[PDB]
Amino acid sequence: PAPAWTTFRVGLFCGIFIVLNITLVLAAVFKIWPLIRIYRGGFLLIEFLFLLGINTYGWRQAGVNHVLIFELNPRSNLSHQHLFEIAGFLGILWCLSLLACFFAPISVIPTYVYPLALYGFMVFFLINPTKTFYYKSRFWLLKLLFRVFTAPFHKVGFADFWLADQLNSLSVILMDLEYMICFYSLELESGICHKYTYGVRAIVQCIPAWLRFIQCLRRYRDTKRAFPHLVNAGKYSTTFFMVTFAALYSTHKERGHSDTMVFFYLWIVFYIISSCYTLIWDLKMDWGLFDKNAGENTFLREEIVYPQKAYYYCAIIEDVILRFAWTIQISITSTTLLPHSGDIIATVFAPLEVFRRFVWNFFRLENEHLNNCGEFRA
Amino acid sequence: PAPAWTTFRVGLFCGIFIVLNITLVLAAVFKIWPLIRIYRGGFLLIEFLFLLGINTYGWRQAGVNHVLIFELNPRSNLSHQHLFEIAGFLGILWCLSLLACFFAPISVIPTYVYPLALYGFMVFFLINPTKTFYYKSRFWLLKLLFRVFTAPFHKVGFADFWLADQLNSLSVILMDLEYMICFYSLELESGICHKYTYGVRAIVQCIPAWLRFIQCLRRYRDTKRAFPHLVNAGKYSTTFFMVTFAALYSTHKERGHSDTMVFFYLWIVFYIISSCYTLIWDLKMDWGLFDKNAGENTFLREEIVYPQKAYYYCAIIEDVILRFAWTIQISITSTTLLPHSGDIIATVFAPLEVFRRFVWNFFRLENEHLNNCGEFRA
Numbered sequence A, B: 001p002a003p004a005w006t007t008f009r010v011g012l013f014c015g016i017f018i019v020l021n022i023t024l025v026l027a028a029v030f031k032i033w034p035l036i037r038i039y040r041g042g043f044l045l046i047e048f049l050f051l052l053g054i055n056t057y058g059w060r061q062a063g064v065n066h067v068l069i070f071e072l073n074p075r076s077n078l079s080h081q082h083l084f085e086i087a088g089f090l091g092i093l094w095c096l097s098l099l100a101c102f103f104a105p106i107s108v109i110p111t112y113v114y115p116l117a118l119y120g121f122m123v124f125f126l127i128n129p130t131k132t133f134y135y136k137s138r139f140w141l142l143k144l145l146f147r148v149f150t151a152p153f154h155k156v157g158f159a160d161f162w163l164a165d166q167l168n169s170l171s172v173i174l175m176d177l178e179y180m181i182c183f184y185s186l187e188l189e190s191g192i193c194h195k196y197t198y199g200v201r202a203i204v205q206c207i208p209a210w211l212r213f214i215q216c217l218r219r220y221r222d223t224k225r226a227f228p229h230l231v232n233a234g235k236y237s238t239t240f241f242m243v244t245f246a247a248l249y250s251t252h253k254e255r256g257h258s259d260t261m262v263f264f265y266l267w268i269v270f271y272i273i274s275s276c277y278t279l280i281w282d283l284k285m286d287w288g289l290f291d292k293n294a295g296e297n298t299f300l301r302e303e304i305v306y307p308q309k310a311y312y313y314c315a316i317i318e319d320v321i322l323r324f325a326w327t328i329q330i331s332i333t334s335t336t337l338l339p340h341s342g343d344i345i346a347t348v349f350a351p352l353e354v355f356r357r358f359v360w361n362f363f364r365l366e367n368e369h370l371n372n373c374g375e376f377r378a
């Protein structure tokens, strides 16, 4: 059981965050920088932390040995309450920064100082040299991130692949960071960054899928099993093909060279291909569903740890829907595409992708515990 | 150990209460009825509940068998966390009502209904017929209150005398209620109730002291022990003398009878008398300190359970100051001695009196557990 003081802190942070969110909404309805884009990354990170705490709680309840799957220390483990506490505290900081930006309480301090301080403090907390807060977990996360970003140089384990998938679900943060860099470089044609797109933008969008693709190639080289690793690599490269076709279509829309429609057709066909590939991989391989052996459970795996099959069915439906939504969101953010509705579409879709990745984490850990689908254990 | 969900709720309520207090302070700084009088009772009740939770925690930590002193059922005991939860929820409701009054969010709904309903809920929370929200403790409290108010009829146990003392420390609530009744009756001469003082106000001021005095007389009759019960009865009657002399002086000021200075001197004499009487009784009898037996602890009883004697000395000093403060508060509130600043002085003093009674409960329960100071046990 978690410490009583930890539960008290979790409750206090949740309450403060709720009241701050209510105040923010009231100020927005009643009462220079792209605040939405600046704060989208922080909001998505807080949501991801909260959903990860929920994932840990559900894994513990279901009996899934997520500690064994992630190779975490059996003696020392991070309770879901700790994740909830961190998410709540970061939510309070995010809401306070947003309120300060909206109100500008202190004139001398410019508005952007609040978001820069928020993000810098979050980074420092992650890389805090001292052992004040969750030092073991933070160091483990830093090592895992370093291994993941260096996908080919280090052998791939379950934790590395899982973190690479999480970063794939969090490409919106990288997109927002790149957009902010462009905004500072050029804004500070006014909206040149949003008006025009470049190859660097597509590369930033595709970096997580590139990391996953290189991880799959490394696993193929180590194990020499062509089928699964190469199929996953194709699944991840569908994203590159789609994004590059969208970029070409947008570029030739800006200047008509008689190839814009070809690029549009390529983008749409590869968008459908990527959506189908990712959805099939998630439903059949990551979750191990639709197997023939299952006789009692229809469209599900023979053994299901979670009590309800309705969970699995709703998960399949929310997986297909949000796979299509995430493909659309990546299309929207990578290129101009829809010029005015792109930002709103991406903002609405990113939390939905975070929720989809949360459900995917649930069911992937379930399948990994029941069967060695990832083949990361002897 | 309290349930984890209870701790989470306590934290949530504390955080929401803190943010609501911050919002109230901001609104007051940036921005028909005497809101202070209306809301002081609720604020004092919430503060008393929080301090009571702290008292329970301290009694449990120090080994004081407060359960046996209060004759509560050993199997079922209300933990400090539950009291904190109740106080936080009540404070949240109080702050919401005050904010609604300040902002008048609903034009159709009159302002004056916002406080009433709040207090109404509190009443319905206390008398809730359904077996919910600590129904057993609520029913025990209701029975204790009924017995205390009908003090002569029933024999005085430790719980009855303790609750009567708590009421003595919370007479400001009754005074505010009576003032509100007068304000509705007459104002709804400007400030007629505030400008003039009447006998009924003095009678209301003496209700808790009357209850304690009659309880002491009943105990004297039951046990036939003259010294303690009669000395305590005189201690409580000093308050009647002070209040009546202050009221007479105020009335004489209102209409010159040529005896105003005589009543001023009499009120001052009885005010010093009451302050000294109450302070001596609390320091020597209720707390049992300054015992001759003690040789290691100076000015303290031989056996001390609390870790620090500095706690005892600080409590002594705070009681010395706050007893005189409380007598001053009673004198001003019961009459029109300080019409310009009487309300502000009473508002500042009442929380201080509540804190003084909190410390007094601490040390009185400690002494009662150590020795049968109240002679409630054989």
Ligand SMILES: CCCCC/C=C\C/C=C\CCCCCCCC(=O)O[C@H](COC(=O)CCCCCCCCCCCCCCC)COP(=O)([O-])OCC[N+](C)(C)C
Residues within 6 Å of the ligand: A045, A052, A056, A070, A072, A073, A076, A077, A078, A086, A119, A122, A123, A125, A126, A136, A137, A138, A140, A141, A166, A167, A170, A173, A174
């Ligand atoms: C694109 C922008 C950046 C994207 C975000 C990047 C990363 C965050 C995502 C996921 C974190 C990993 C979740 C754990 C999964 C394993 C299951 C489990 O719950 O295991 C936990 C591992 O705890 C963790 O890893 C920490 C959880 C996350 C805490 C968040 C820290 C602050 C982050 C601030 C923002 C950082 C970015 C800067 C802003 C731009 C068990 O803990 P333990 O103490 O047993 O650890 C083992 C330690 N031994 C082996 C030595 C005993």
Ligand SMILES: CCCCC/C=C\C/C=C\CCCCCCCC(=O)O[C@H](COC(=O)CCCCCCCCCCCCCCC)COP(=O)([O-])OCC[N+](C)(C)C
Residues within 6 Å of the ligand: B045, B052, B056, B070, B072, B073, B076, B077, B078, B079, B083, B086, B119, B122, B123, B125, B126, B134, B136, B137, B138, B140, B141, B173, B174
């Ligand atoms: C204008 C008048 C204002 C109202 C009067 C003032 C204060 C009321 C509140 C508390 C006074 C009682 C404190 C007793 C503490 C003893 C030590 C202990 O903490 O032990 C507790 C005492 O439990 C209590 O009594 C409950 C404590 C208070 C909780 C809050 C109740 C709601 C109050 C709302 C007031 C609304 C008024 C509106 C305006 C009129 C043991 O708990 P148990 O669950 O074992 O209870 C015993 C149950 N058996 C005997 C069956 C096992």
Ligand SMILES: CC(C)CCC[C@@H](C)[C@H]1CC[C@H]2[C@@H]3CC=C4C[C@@H](O)CC[C@]4(C)[C@H]3CC[C@]12C
Residues within 6 Å of the ligand: A058, A061, A062, A306, A311, A312, A314, A315, A317, A318, A359, A362
């Ligand atoms: C609204 C629709 C489209 C979303 C899809 C259904 C959602 C609500 C389903 C999908 C997977 C489900 C989760 C699957 C597993 C668990 C673990 C269990 O111990 C508690 C419930 C919990 C946490 C479920 C809650 C409901 C859930 C999140």
Ligand SMILES: CC(C)CCC[C@@H](C)[C@H]1CC[C@H]2[C@@H]3CC=C4C[C@@H](O)CC[C@]4(C)[C@H]3CC[C@]12C
Residues within 6 Å of the ligand: B054, B058, B061, B062, B306, B311, B312, B314, B315, B317, B318, B359, B362
């Ligand atoms: C006004 C100034 C001079 C003195 C103020 C002293 C106050 C703060 C002192 C008086 C009695 C003290 C309490 C006496 C006993 C306990 C029980 C212990 O387990 C925790 C601390 C606690 C709860 C103390 C906290 C501090 C306290 C409330």
